[PDB]
Amino acid sequence: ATVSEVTYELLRARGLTTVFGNPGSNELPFLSGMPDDFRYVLGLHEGAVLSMADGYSLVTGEATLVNLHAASGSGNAMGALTNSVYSHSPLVVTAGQQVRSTIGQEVMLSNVDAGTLMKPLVKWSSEPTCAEDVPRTINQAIHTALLPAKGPVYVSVPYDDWAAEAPPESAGLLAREVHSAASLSGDQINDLIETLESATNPVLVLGPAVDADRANADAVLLAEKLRAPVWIAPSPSRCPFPTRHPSFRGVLPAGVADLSKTLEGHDLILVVGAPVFRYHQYVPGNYLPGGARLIHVTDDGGEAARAPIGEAYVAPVGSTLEILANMVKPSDRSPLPPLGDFEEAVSVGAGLDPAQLFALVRAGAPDDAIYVNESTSTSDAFWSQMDLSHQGSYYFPASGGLGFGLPAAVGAQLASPDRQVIGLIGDGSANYGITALWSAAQYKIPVVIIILNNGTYGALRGFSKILNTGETPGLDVPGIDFVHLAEGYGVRGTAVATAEDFTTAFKSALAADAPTLIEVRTNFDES
Amino acid sequence: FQGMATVSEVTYELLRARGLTTVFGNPGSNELPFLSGMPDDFRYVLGLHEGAVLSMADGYSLVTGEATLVNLHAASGSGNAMGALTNSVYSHSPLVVTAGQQVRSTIGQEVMLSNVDAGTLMKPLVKWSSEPTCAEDVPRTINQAIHTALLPAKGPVYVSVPYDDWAAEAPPESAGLLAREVHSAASLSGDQINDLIETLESATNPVLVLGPAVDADRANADAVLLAEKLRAPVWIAPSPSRCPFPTRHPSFRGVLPAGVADLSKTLEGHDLILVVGAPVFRYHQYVPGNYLPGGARLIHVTDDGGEAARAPIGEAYVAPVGSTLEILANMVKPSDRSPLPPLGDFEEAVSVGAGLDPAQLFALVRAGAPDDAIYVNESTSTSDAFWSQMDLSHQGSYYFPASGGLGFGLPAAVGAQLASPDRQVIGLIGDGSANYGITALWSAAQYKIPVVIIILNNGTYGALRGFSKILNTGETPGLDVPGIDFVHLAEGYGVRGTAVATAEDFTTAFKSALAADAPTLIEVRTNFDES
Amino acid sequence: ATVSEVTYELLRARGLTTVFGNPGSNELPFLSGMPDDFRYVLGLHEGAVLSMADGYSLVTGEATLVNLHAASGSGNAMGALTNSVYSHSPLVVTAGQQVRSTIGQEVMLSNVDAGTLMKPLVKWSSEPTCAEDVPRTINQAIHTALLPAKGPVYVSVPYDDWAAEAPPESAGLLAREVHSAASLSGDQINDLIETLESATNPVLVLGPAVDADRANADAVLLAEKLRAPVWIAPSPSRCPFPTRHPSFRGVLPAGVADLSKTLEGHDLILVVGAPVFRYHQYVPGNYLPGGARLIHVTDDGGEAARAPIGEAYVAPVGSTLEILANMVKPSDRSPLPPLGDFEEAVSVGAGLDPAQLFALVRAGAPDDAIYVNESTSTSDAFWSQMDLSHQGSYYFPASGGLGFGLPAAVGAQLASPDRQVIGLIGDGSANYGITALWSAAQYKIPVVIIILNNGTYGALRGFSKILNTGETPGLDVPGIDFVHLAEGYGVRGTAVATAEDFTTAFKSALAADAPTLIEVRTNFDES
Numbered sequence A, C: 001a002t003v004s005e006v007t008y009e010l011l012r013a014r015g016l017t018t019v020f021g022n023p024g025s026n027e028l029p030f031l032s033g034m035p036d037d038f039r040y041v042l043g044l045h046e047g048a049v050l051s052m053a054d055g056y057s058l059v060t061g062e063a064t065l066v067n068l069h070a071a072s073g074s075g076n077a078m079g080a081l082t083n084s085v086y087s088h089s090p091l092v093v094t095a096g097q098q099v100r101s102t103i104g105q106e107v108m109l110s111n112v113d114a115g116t117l118m119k120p121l122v123k124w125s126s127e128p129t130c131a132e133d134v135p136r137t138i139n140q141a142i143h144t145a146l147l148p149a150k151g152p153v154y155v156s157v158p159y160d161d162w163a164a165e166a167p168p169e170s171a172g173l174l175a176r177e178v179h180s181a182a183s184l185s186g187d188q189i190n191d192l193i194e195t196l197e198s199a200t201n202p203v204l205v206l207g208p209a210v211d212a213d214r215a216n217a218d219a220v221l222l223a224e225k226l227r228a229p230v231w232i233a234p235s236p237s238r239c240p241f242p243t244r245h246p247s248f249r250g251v252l253p254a255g256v257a258d259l260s261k262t263l264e265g266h267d268l269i270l271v272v273g274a275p276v277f278r279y280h281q282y283v284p285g286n287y288l289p290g291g292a293r294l295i296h297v298t299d300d301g302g303e304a305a306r307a308p309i310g311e312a313y314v315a316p317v318g319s320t321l322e323i324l325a326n327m328v329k330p331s332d333r334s335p336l337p338p339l340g341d342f343e344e345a346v347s348v349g350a351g352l353d354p355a356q357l358f359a360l361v362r363a364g365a366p367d368d369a370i371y372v373n374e375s376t377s378t379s380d381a382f383w384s385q386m387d388l389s390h391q392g393s394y395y396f397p398a399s400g401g402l403g404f405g406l407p408a409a410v411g412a413q414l415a416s417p418d419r420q421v422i423g424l425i426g427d428g429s430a431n432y433g434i435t436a437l438w439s440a441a442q443y444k445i446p447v448v449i450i451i452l453n454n455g456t457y458g459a460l461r462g463f464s465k466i467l468n469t470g471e472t473p474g475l476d477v478p479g480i481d482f483v484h485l486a487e488g489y490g491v492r493g494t495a496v497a498t499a500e501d502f503t504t505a506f507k508s509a510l511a512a513d514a515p516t517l518i519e520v521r522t523n524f525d526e527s
Numbered sequence B: 001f002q003g004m005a006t007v008s009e010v011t012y013e014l015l016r017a018r019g020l021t022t023v024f025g026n027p028g029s030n031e032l033p034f035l036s037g038m039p040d041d042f043r044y045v046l047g048l049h050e051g052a053v054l055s056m057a058d059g060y061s062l063v064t065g066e067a068t069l070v071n072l073h074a075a076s077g078s079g080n081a082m083g084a085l086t087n088s089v090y091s092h093s094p095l096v097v098t099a100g101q102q103v104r105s106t107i108g109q110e111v112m113l114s115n116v117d118a119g120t121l122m123k124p125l126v127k128w129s130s131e132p133t134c135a136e137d138v139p140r141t142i143n144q145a146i147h148t149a150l151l152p153a154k155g156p157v158y159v160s161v162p163y164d165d166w167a168a169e170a171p172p173e174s175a176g177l178l179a180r181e182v183h184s185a186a187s188l189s190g191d192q193i194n195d196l197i198e199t200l201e202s203a204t205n206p207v208l209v210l211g212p213a214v215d216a217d218r219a220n221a222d223a224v225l226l227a228e229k230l231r232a233p234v235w236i237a238p239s240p241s242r243c244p245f246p247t248r249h250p251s252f253r254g255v256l257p258a259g260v261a262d263l264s265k266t267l268e269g270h271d272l273i274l275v276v277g278a279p280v281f282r283y284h285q286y287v288p289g290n291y292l293p294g295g296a297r298l299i300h301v302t303d304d305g306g307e308a309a310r311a312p313i314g315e316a317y318v319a320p321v322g323s324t325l326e327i328l329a330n331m332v333k334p335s336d337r338s339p340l341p342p343l344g345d346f347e348e349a350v351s352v353g354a355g356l357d358p359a360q361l362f363a364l365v366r367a368g369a370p371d372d373a374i375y376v377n378e379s380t381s382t383s384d385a386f387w388s389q390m391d392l393s394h395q396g397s398y399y400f401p402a403s404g405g406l407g408f409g410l411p412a413a414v415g416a417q418l419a420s421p422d423r424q425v426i427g428l429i430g431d432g433s434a435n436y437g438i439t440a441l442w443s444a445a446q447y448k449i450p451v452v453i454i455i456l457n458n459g460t461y462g463a464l465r466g467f468s469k470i471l472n473t474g475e476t477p478g479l480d481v482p483g484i485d486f487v488h489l490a491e492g493y494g495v496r497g498t499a500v501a502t503a504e505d506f507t508t509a510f511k512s513a514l515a516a517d518a519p520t521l522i523e524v525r526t527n528f529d530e531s
């Protein structure tokens, strides 16, 4: 058996039968041995490749294989790889390397220190020391990617290694499983449940790891038992809670003073499956309101260690929430009132207000749509206006690395055969991942992409107000036709400027067997 | 005192002092405080994508020779530029890349848009990288960054600055920083010359192999004079990124093949290989055999000590390529050989197919294009065609990505053109390559940069079909890129584009494009040999 | 309140009141603010300091603070720090750095990239970006060091930072706790207990994490229930099991072929709290014997991912073993017979055979002595001849980094007020940590150090036989008088070459209230 034959038998064994790639000189020898039950998904650009892989991974929860070209290809993906770290995405990224004997002379398409290139992002990286060790290195890469705290891994393989004889002890590799402890001490539970039934006025703050661990329902049950309001942790990348449940209050602001002012009056903040906290704008003050204690539950030891306040429990979010939800006593307090009806959304301007666009999307879109959002200035509008209740209904770049949305939408859709993925991309964001449109065309991936085109980097105009920087060079991106870009990559696109035309183009796009792009002209509030 | 200056005011006074008045950027939360203090004599060039930004900066740098400033956003923006940065390393391009970082007190908690270990992110590419330990040290860190970028062996440097540092009071002793110069020894021992000239006048049949650093050091003329004096054939070192010699000079023989056995077979018969301004060697395809032909000794002259150390054969001299070549050219004795005959006429260029053969397209480009065009090439399968068919005779006439990192060509062309007020830049980009830097077309449109971009569209990754023959890998997934309209992409970014499939229509579209005051794209349908 | 005042209030809060150090220019400002309830332990050499800290940490289980000097001081400790990684030792190593404004100009005693210097060893390293962040960086360092998988952390602090005003939000830091899930799913248990009661002829292989988690008793109960033989995993750094219990069989050989041949006949290898496996000598072949499946239980996800065979469970070793021990059914199989008598130990030679010296040590030493071993060629002798029956009775350098033994003995003794620590150091090993004798003298630490002096690097003569390298330069270390070295550092020393004189010197040394060193002349088998 060759290193290639054993590696492929192993990827199949682990469910990595979808490969996202942009190929090169040094990866043809890997790709040549590829079996017929595997599918290769080509992207024209490594950032798109990797972000497509990321979206595919987020929807499935499964590890996902990426194959990139040398240093130039791996480098082009570093920006996207940041999002994978904070989204706890088990991408397994393999890179082709030049013939093993020639790397030292730095011949053309040598990756010099391949283990260093992708640090400090990836949890783990290896250039195996010999062809023999390539299969076990890939086994270790996969187990490592799926180990709490989940995350991306990188393996650089010299192209001549694939042809080498595989080591005898490789039937051994296939058989390997690695399990995580899926709970925490019985003693440590009774402390959590005492503190919860103790609290006079508690609040749940929920992060992406609740959505990742498919614990939306157990979060709901725990909010019902405590009659507790529920906020989403700041800078959210996923939606961990039904947005029209009585307990839902929205997203905490990502300012230190602003977040503590919002939670004023609560004696216990229980934060589940989020860092404490993913602040953004620098607005200094108190982490907590007076007379408040914070309990913190996370898969990520890094998150628990680096928090500046609180009592953390490092444990699986799924299990913990399931246990607490099924064992806390219903409280005395009255069940919470139903939420106000959705605020009314008028539009005065040449185009649509984001608030109105999202209300039109709510009315038109399937009950079980998946929304891949990368529309930086429209957050307040989205949350005040969307009705999400399925697991896995919202994805946003977890480190605000732009060029996630368009590609992640395509990848999410490929993973989601019976759920409609709708991309809501700004005109700025779309340019970082535009070539993923070609992949949707080629592989007939029926995504809907909505470009919110306000002619500007809106969120950066928002910041030049808070930072008193004023009229800075390069806030404006005028003169982009996204219909021309879509047709350039073989995707059918229409431009739209009124509610009636949008409702039409959207109803149409949801019916389509093919990728569709709608360019909406949107208005930016210049206060 | 009332002579109180901010870190921003001193940094800007310094960038002006050093000629870095052109800034390439894609902005973010953490860079607005830098950009806000930017003066009026400075120009910001926005790119929609950091790889495009940085490749534009690279092109601008290659034409001028000067250090060039880039400003990127945090970890996500810096990471998007790692691919492009590889080309900067092998092209010895003095890019100074600054990145915004989150407020200094908040980086440890890893708040949103924290770069965690900013110094590690860009290793091992950049020669040098710093996150200064305080606001006070930001000006000197940037001074050091610039001197370091321009120091043999030239290359890219990275500085991550927390955004709150710009507003901090600058250190007292900063008039001192401006006054700073750093000079490199621009020559080598008199004794060491007489060894070079003895070995050269010794050789019964010597050959010059020339690399990018001859073009970088503006030594094209002195290389010519040296080839005239030795009546020596001149080859370009393999996997060239620049053209260091006139391609229609008597001595010109073309590009050495980038295989070990193939290169040594080509130089068979020569007793002295003098390699100037190149690694030994930038091989690509693994074709094993002898590094040198029988009876041959290799002299190797390079600014780069790394290149001299890592070479697997040869006697190297680490010295400035410019000076060395100037000295040798002016002091070697005319040899007892006949001056070399003029080159044959250009081979004839017929095209059988639905489109143009690259050899015919390049012959049409030769006939249409000004004497002094600059060509930015990123067309991987068309190399033999280019060299057999182009008449390059001026410094700085050819750029190709120095680590074959694709997404250099389109953006580097735009940047090269911005730097090149009196010379037409012509991009020759494949349909594959163009997608890695497509957004640089927007920058050309916005800033009214009169580049001509020729997409050679053969519907495929041609050079990878070339490789699946040599590597016996066969029908591999993802060799084909069908269903892309570059005219639609150009018009999408506000560049005027036409598609063309015959010599008559190409000659027309090209004559027109060269007259334009605006970026123009010609999509040529080309033929790929499947037999 | 200054960064120094808050840092000290925090170290006290966390029980880090014992500080091991070698001081310099850049650490005086930290040390000056040290309170009276704290003790500083000076070592003359950073390797010794850090190995002393390691020994102190191993006996207590607690995180332990080290303070080193700049790049030259930190560099001198890199070797010792390797042992801390593989011994899962929560050392918190702080280093002084030059004044923050002057680091860039690389003035004298600048650490250039302090975060890079100690990678890839330490789990985690920071140079805080400002004085304000120094207390939280140290809080994060501590939590990180104690988080499964435990290990060393490094923090470089510019000396001017200690004097800076501390941030408002510092009462917050003190209050912080981080707990680990101290168990694993009820479902995942029933799989373990089925597989164990299933097996016709199972074997326990035990590693250092059993001793670290104070699970010696529960390992015993589980071996009694399965009437199972117990081996220690190869290259052991701790003793996880009573050596005179019926089930005890010794240490597995650290060769691939040799280990699988030893376990031939077993259908289930359960490995608890060790890597799979810590091989040394390259003796190639089959990882497992035919018809064998390996279950692997570890706190370390790194250990579980990189293993080349086995079904791994990443979980707390203490809990797991306690659960299994209390819930597996007693088996049909006959209770195991009492062990063979200790083999006879005669000596023909100018000195003692190691086997005879260890039998003299067995007879003379308290039931509950702690042995710190760094005697590379004497392993077979130690295990065939010692009666260890208590938690924390054996320590050996976990990456065979020499210069652990002498210092770890001193540190172990300082931590161990009512148990006698006995160091068994070779003449080779002793030179790497000799200066720790000074620390024992200064702080009146009643360690007993036995130098086994065979005039040679014995284990390297052992290897030049297996590697057919022959008479290699530098196998011999003649002309060293350890009595002169002891007295040089203010420790009482005697040299000894017969059983009768050893029994005398040893009886005397156990009576001492002061460090004592015995140099025994030993014989090396050149066969």
Ligand SMILES: Cc1ncc(C[n+]2csc(CCOP(=O)(O)OP(=O)(O)O)c2C)c(N)n1
Pocket (backbone or CB within 6 Å): A079, A374, A375, A376, A377, A378, A400, A401, A402, A403, A425, A426, A427, A428, A429, A430, A432, A452, A454, A456, A457, A458, A459, A460, B026, B027, B028, B029, B073, B076, B077, B080
């Ligand atoms: C790779 C990368 N480059 C730059 C940024 C900075 N950035 C964040 S918000 C923003 C504006 C994006 O514009 P658009 O998508 O149009 O959103 P809008 O604010 O207009 O709703 C930019 C450029 C980033 N986060 N990531």
Ligand SMILES: Cc1ncc(C[n+]2csc(CCOP(=O)(O)OP(=O)(O)O)c2C)c(N)n1
Pocket (backbone or CB within 6 Å): A022, A023, A024, A025, A069, A072, A073, A076, B083, B378, B379, B380, B381, B382, B404, B405, B406, B407, B429, B430, B431, B432, B433, B434, B436, B458, B460, B461, B462, B463, B464
């Ligand atoms: C960033 C990057 N990804 C992948 C490669 C591998 N590669 C080498 S040539 C090539 C095909 C591009 O060819 P194209 O521009 O279509 O020109 P042609 O081969 O048709 O002449 C690719 C993808 C690379 N060099 N750089």
Ligand SMILES: Cc1ncc(C[n+]2csc(CCOP(=O)(O)OP(=O)(O)O)c2C)c(N)n1
Pocket (backbone or CB within 6 Å): C079, C374, C375, C376, C377, C378, C400, C401, C402, C403, C425, C426, C427, C428, C429, C430, C432, C454, C456, C457, C458, C459, C460
């Ligand atoms: C820091 C370090 N350097 C070198 C070695 C290699 N080494 C391992 S065993 C050994 C010899 C030590 O001999 P000694 O302690 O006298 O014991 P003996 O072999 O005679 O039992 C050496 C040099 C090592 N393990 N650690």
Ligand code: NA
Pocket (backbone or CB within 6 Å): A426, A427, A428, A452, A453, A454, A455, A456, A457, A458
């Ligand atoms: Na916008």
Ligand code: NA
Pocket (backbone or CB within 6 Å): B430, B431, B432, B456, B457, B458, B459, B460, B461, B462
């Ligand atoms: Na092509």
Ligand code: NA
Pocket (backbone or CB within 6 Å): C426, C427, C428, C452, C453, C454, C455, C456, C457, C458
């Ligand atoms: Na010895």
